[PDB]
Amino acid sequence: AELTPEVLTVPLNSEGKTITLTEKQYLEGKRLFQYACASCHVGGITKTNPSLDLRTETLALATPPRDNIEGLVDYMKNPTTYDGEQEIAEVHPSLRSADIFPKMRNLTEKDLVAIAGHILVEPKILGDKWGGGKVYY
Amino acid sequence: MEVNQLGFIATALFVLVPSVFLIILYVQTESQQKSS
Amino acid sequence: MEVNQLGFIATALFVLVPSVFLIILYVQTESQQKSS
Amino acid sequence: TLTYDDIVGTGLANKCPTLDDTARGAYPIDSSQTYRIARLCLQPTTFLVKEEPKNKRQEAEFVPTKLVTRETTSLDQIQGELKVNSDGSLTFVEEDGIDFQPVTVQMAGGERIPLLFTVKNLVASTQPNVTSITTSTDFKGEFNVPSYRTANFLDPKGRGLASGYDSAIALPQAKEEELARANVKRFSLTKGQISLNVAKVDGRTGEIAGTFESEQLSDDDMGAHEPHEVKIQGVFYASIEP
Amino acid sequence: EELVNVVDEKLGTAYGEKIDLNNTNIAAFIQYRGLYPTLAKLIVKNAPYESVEDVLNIPGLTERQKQILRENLEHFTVTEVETALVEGGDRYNNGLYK
Amino acid sequence: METITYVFIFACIIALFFFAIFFREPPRIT
Amino acid sequence: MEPNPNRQPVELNRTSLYLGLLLILVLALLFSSYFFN
Amino acid sequence: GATLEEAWSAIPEKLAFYDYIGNNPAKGGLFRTGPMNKGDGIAQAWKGH
Ligand code: CLA
Ligand code: CLA
Ligand SMILES: CCCCCCCCCCCCCCCC(=O)O[C@H](COC(=O)CCCCCCCCCCCC)CO[C@@H]1O[C@@H](CO)[C@H](O)[C@H](O)[C@@H]1O
Ligand code: HEM
Numbered sequence: 001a002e003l004t005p006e007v008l009t010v011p012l013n014s015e016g017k018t019i020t021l022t023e024k025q026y027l028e029g030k031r032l033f034q035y036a037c038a039s040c041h042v043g044g045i046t047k048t049n050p051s052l053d054l055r056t057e058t059l060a061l062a063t064p065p066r067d068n069i070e071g072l073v074d075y076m077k078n079p080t081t082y083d084g085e086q087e088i089a090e091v092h093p094s095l096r097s098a099d100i101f102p103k104m105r106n107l108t109e110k111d112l113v114a115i116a117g118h119i120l121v122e123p124k125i126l127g128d129k130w131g132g133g134k135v136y137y
Numbered sequence: 138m139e140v141n142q143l144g145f146i147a148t149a150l151f152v153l154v155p156s157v158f159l160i161i162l163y164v165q166t167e168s169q170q171k172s173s
Numbered sequence: 174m175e176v177n178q179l180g181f182i183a184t185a186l187f188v189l190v191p192s193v194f195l196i197i198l199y200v201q202t203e204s205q206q207k208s209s
Numbered sequence: 210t211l212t213y214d215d216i217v218g219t220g221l222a223n224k225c226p227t228l229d230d231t232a233r234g235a236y237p238i239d240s241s242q243t244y245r246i247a248r249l250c251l252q253p254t255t256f257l258v259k260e261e262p263k264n265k266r267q268e269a270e271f272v273p274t275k276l277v278t279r280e281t282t283s284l285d286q287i288q289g290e291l292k293v294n295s296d297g298s299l300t301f302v303e304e305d306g307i308d309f310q311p312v313t314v315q316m317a318g319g320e321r322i323p324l325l326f327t328v329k330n331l332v333a334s335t336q337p338n339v340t341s342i343t344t345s346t347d348f349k350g351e352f353n354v355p356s357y358r359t360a361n362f363l364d365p366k367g368r369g370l371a372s373g374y375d376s377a378i379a380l381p382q383a384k385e386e387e388l389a390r391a392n393v394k395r396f397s398l399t400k401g402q403i404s405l406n407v408a409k410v411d412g413r414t415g416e417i418a419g420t421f422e423s424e425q426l427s428d429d430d431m432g433a434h435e436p437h438e439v440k441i442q443g444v445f446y447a448s449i450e451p
Numbered sequence: 452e453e454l455v456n457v458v459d460e461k462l463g464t465a466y467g468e469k470i471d472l473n474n475t476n477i478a479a480f481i482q483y484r485g486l487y488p489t490l491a492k493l494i495v496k497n498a499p500y501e502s503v504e505d506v507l508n509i510p511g512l513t514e515r516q517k518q519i520l521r522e523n524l525e526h527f528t529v530t531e532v533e534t535a536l537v538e539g540g541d542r543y544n545n546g547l548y549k
Numbered sequence: 550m551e552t553i554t555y556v557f558i559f560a561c562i563i564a565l566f567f568f569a570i571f572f573r574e575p576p577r578i579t
Numbered sequence: 580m581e582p583n584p585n586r587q588p589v590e591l592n593r594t595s596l597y598l599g600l601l602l603i604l605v606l607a608l609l610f611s612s613y614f615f616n
Numbered sequence: 617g618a619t620l621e622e623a624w625s626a627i628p629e630k631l632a633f634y635d636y637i638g639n640n641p642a643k644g645g646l647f648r649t650g651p652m653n654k655g656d657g658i659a660q661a662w663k664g665h
């Protein structure tokens with residue numbers, strides 16, 4: 001009714017294709033996002049390094065584009081700075097590096113796609129409350 | 138310290154005026170026996 | 174009028190402090206009969 | 210040979226390295242060798258505040274002051290290439306290191322004068338025709354002294370420089386001007402000028418120690434008061450390597 | 452004889468409109484395709500530039516990096532280094548977090 | 550000045566403690 | 580805690596008080612001026 | 617053998633001061649309520665003879 005189909009529909013590829021979505025996947029998104037750890041990352045900011053946020057625009061300006069339901073996947077699989085210059089894999093949860101961050105082991109392409117869709121979706125509803133912290137709270 | 142001017146006559150008189158009342162009423166009574 | 178600052182606490186207390194004494198000593202005595 | 214768990218508590222880490230009396234043996238400088246300094250340390254002891262002389266014009270004074278903040282004073286871990294320019298004199302250009310310890314000494318009266326003991330952006334040089342560092346050698350050069358406080362900083366009542374309430378605030382219809390001193394917070398930048406004479410040198414180690422005297426300014430306090438002059442004394446160690 | 456706030460004034464130069472190579476916080480560097488991460492560490496490090504272009508002639512810049520800068524050159528500007536803005540290594544961490 | 554006013558009160562009160570404890574009207578068991 | 584004999588009462592009559600007051604109220608009236616400088 | 621200038625610039629602060637009627641105890645007033653300072657003010661320095 002409010003969490004509508006297309007409002008739950010988001011960009012897939014840097015090429016335009018949209019994957020829409022389900023109430024099921026979205027949920028795993030929430031369950032995940034938090035379990036995958038919001039511990040630094042809670043709400044829509046980034047406690048280890050507050051300079052970078054998860055707001056839609058920020059992910060677009062990233063390199064490579066990281067607003068794609070795809071993008072975030074590469075990342076979670078293998079991480080890269082906002083340079084896309086050096087792999088940040090050792091300091092960031094990543095399937096490339098499971099042996100460091102356990103929570104990242106039980107993760108799957110199914111589980112990923114979800115935690116992903118969660119990121120591109122949350123802004124659509126929460127508005128700015130997504131990027132900002134304290135201030136907007 | 139830039140403070141109010143009546144600080145003294147205010148605070149002070151506030152003490153000595155009512156106080157003096159009680160003072161009076163006591164020694165006025167403790168003198169019933171002519172003692173005091 | 175630029176005058177001294179203690180004018181009030183000076184002149185004033187000068188009145189009320191000794192005066193209060195006499196006041197006391199009177200009603201302390203006029204109360205020997207318990208009257209007052 | 211001493212561990213942190215061995216030296217912590219002594220209030221020793223604030224006093225830095227000595228050189229035993231086997232010194233006076235000059236260090237063999239090349240002119241064919243690059244040379245750099247390893248942890249140059251300035252441990253201090255004597256803080257003198259030039260007394261804001263009264264209106265009368267007869268020799269302004271340099272009173273002695275009492276230290277307040279216990280041991281948070283010394284500075285070291287300073288490093289920088291030690292240049293060997295023509296006429297065989299050495300110039301040491303500091304690149305970084307812990308060098309801005311903020312201290313607050315209590316003046317003759319009750320004054321709390323705070324300065325930022327520092328030897329930053331330091332460029333010290335010595336006498337010419339020197340192929341060896343010894344009790345003879347000495348170092349003189351300039352500084353760079355910002356201000357006690359950074360750019361941000363809110364004085365009680367909210368005012369500030371690169372932030373902060375911006376005005377009288379608490380007083381709304383108050384008389385704007387005359388508070389300029391307080392509101393607009395200017396930020397100082399001034400020269401220091403130390404002087405380093407060696408007293409104990411080891412020939413092989415590259416180690417060298419001695420007394421130093423820095424003459425700098427105090428706390429600008431954004432604009433508050435005109436700073437007070439300060440002279441600083443104490444011994445200093447400073448190991449040299451190639 | 453009229454003292455005045457420095458940051459407030461320099462906010463009146465081109466510093467307030469674009470990104471100041473010599474002063475501006477390193478944080479305003481993310482707002483453009485692939486600049487933040489490294490290029491910035493070099494942009495910010497590396498002496499203060501008298502000309503907006505001397506950026507392009509920075510020791511060791513990469514054949515690609517070189518490009519980027521060129522590309523983004525649009526948004527960079529300069530003004531005297533500001534003692535109050537650069538001291539305290541604030542440029543690396545201005546005290547401004549989300 | 551005003552800080553003496555503070556200290557004067559503060560004090561005459563400590564002495565209202567004197568009298569009220571040591572020259573206080575005693576409890577008469579009758 | 581044995582009563583001291585010398586406990587004579589004190590005296591200031593309905594009149595003496597009028598004078599005592601007339602005495603002060605006056606100087607007060609006189610010096611006030613000089614107490615203002 | 618000194619400039620009339622070196623001469624007086626020779627005389628010591630405190631001493632000139634003593635030669636200032638403003639310290640001569642008599643000059644006061646029975647009701648002149650306070651410390652010599654809210655009088656001529658706070659002596660900051662000697663101007664010169
Ligand atoms: C201003 C309005 C007002 C009016 C019309 C009255 C009228 C009265 N008061 Mg009274 N009184 C007042 C204000 C007033 N009072 C205030 C502000 C106080 C604070 C102390 C008192 C305290 C007081 C006491 C303890 C007693 C009265 C008594 C009385 C009655 C007897 C007449 C008298 O002399 O009073 C007495 C007081 C005054 C006439 C003036 C008091 C002004 C204060 C107390 C100055 C400092 C104390 C001083 C008066 C000593 C009073 C001790 C005692 C004799 C009252 C009379 C009905 C009774 C009485 O007079 O006979 C037993 C009585 O016992 N009053
Ligand atoms: C500061 C030095 C000083 C000392 C060592 C004494 C010592 C004494 N006074 Mg005393 N007195 C003083 C100053 C002093 N007085 C001043 C400045 C006054 C102006 C009023 C008085 C007025 C006074 C009276 C009327 C009487 C004494 C009495 C006495 C003797 C009994 C103890 C007593 O309670 O006094 C009484 C007074 C005080 C203890 C404090 C008085 C301070 C003034 C009066 C405040 C305003 C009035 C208040 C005290 C009411 C007092 C009424 C009366 C009970 C005294 C004792 C030897 C006699 C006594 O106490 O027993 C009969 C006595 O009758 N005094
Ligand atoms: C010229 C115009 C100017 C206008 C005003 C002029 C009026 C002057 C009148 C004065 C007459 C001469 C001397 C009067 C003396 C007198 O009066 O003496 C006693 C009065 O009490 C008194 O007043 C006793 C004085 C107590 C004053 C209390 C304030 C001073 C100390 C307060 C300290 C507080 C920290 C009364 O008499 C005394 O007491 C009597 C008993 O009632 C005895 O019989 C004796 O006569 C004994 O001498
Ligand atoms: C588990 C779910 C997480 C997801 C989906 C996620 C996602 C991301 C993304 C997309 C970025 C890059 C943002 C951009 O440049 O646009 C990033 C950066 C970063 N993340 Fe996470 N993150 C997660 C968990 C964590 C955790 C648990 C930490 C704690 C260490 C962390 C620390 C960081 C840091 C420090 C950066 C900045 C990288 C740098 O520039 O050095 N992340 N994250």
Ligand SMILES: CC1=C(/C=C/C(C)=C/C=C\C(C)=C\C=C/C=C(C)/C=C/C=C(C)/C=C/C2=C(C)CCCC2(C)C)C(C)(C)CCC1
Binds near residue numbers: 143146147150
């Ligand atoms: C000072 C001050 C002030 C105020 C004031 C006042 C106001 C005071 C007072 C007070 C007063 C002014 C009070 C009053 C009153 C009163 C009275 C005093 C009363 C009464 C009465 C009596 C006492 C008596 C009476 C009678 C008799 C005698 C008997 C019977 C009959 C008849 C009733 C008539 C100010 C603000 C500036 C501030 C500072 C301080």
Ligand SMILES: CC1=C(/C=C/C(C)=C/C=C\C(C)=C\C=C/C=C(C)/C=C/C=C(C)/C=C/C2=C(C)CCCC2(C)C)C(C)(C)CCC1
Binds near residue numbers: 179182186
């Ligand atoms: C204020 C003023 C002033 C001055 C002042 C004064 C100084 C006051 C006061 C006063 C006083 C300060 C007085 C005093 C005193 C006293 C007394 C008060 C006394 C005593 C005592 C008593 C009361 C008691 C005692 C006792 C008892 C209790 C019993 C027995 C034992 C004995 C002896 C211990 C001036 C200049 C600023 C000016 C303005 C005003």
Ligand SMILES: CC1=C(/C=C/C(C)=C/C=C\C(C)=C\C=C/C=C(C)/C=C/C=C(C)/C=C/C2=C(C)CCCC2(C)C)C(C)(C)CCC1
Binds near residue numbers: 553560564566568570
């Ligand atoms: C500025 C002036 C002044 C003033 C003064 C005054 C204001 C005073 C006073 C007064 C006072 C200041 C008072 C007081 C007091 C008293 C006392 C202080 C007492 C006491 C008490 C006690 C000590 C107690 C004890 C006890 C008790 C009671 C019980 C419990 C606890 C005990 C046991 C401990 C003078 C003169 C300095 C100088 C000139 C001017």
